[PDB]
């Protein structure tokens, strides 16, 4: 009953239908990053008894980010050659 649905709702056959019904302009990129931040915020943070997990996630994410950034310079000391 709807053209645009949550990408999980849509099927594989109409997969490209979803890919083409949606927009791509940078404004529609900010209007996505914002939605992500605000889902996280209003679901795990803006609550009267926020916990560690309300924060630890972004930290342990930034961690993996800056690990991926560094992969190149770390292929030079693998303790074993044939992995």
């Amino acid at each position: 009953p709807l053209k645009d649905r949550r990408l999980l709702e849509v099927k594989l056959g109409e997969l490209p239908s979803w890919i083409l019904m949606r927009d791509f302009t940078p404004s529609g990129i900010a209007g996505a990053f914002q939605r992500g931040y605000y889902r996280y915020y209003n679901k795990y943070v803006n609550v009267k008894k926020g916990s560690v997990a309300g924060l630890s996630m972004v930290l342990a994410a930034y961690v993996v980010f800056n690990y991926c950034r560094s992969y190149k310079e770390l292929k030079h000391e693998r303790l074993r050659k044939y992995h």
Partner: protein, 94 residues
């Protein structure tokens, strides 16, 4: 003209990963699918050396040990601390 909040949002396992994952996975393996899933993910990363081990490993271990110590010892103290500040502003105004 503003909305209120819940009492506590999405509950979480290990303090890091959400549970909704677990339930979404309940139908097929139920309970002991996610844990072995992660164990395998990690033994894989380690085996093929997608994650080589060095000093920074132990640095991370130490920082994390410190942090969990701190929280598991001071958490609710800080929580009541903050709720106290809130009720205190409420009163000092009220």
């Amino acid at each position: 003209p503003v909305p209120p909040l819940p009492e506590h949002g999405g509950k979480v396992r290990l303090g890091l990963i959400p549970e909704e994952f677990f339930q979404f996975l309940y139908p097929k393996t139920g309970v002991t699918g996610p844990y072995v899933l992660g164990t395998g993910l990690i033994l894989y990363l380690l085996s093929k050396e997608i994650y080589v081990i060095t000093a920074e490993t132990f640095s991370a271990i130490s920082t994390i040990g410190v942090l969990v110590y701190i929280v598991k010892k001071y958490g609710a103290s800080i929580g009541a601390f903050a709720d106290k500040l809130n009720e205190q502003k409420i009163a000092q105004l009220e």
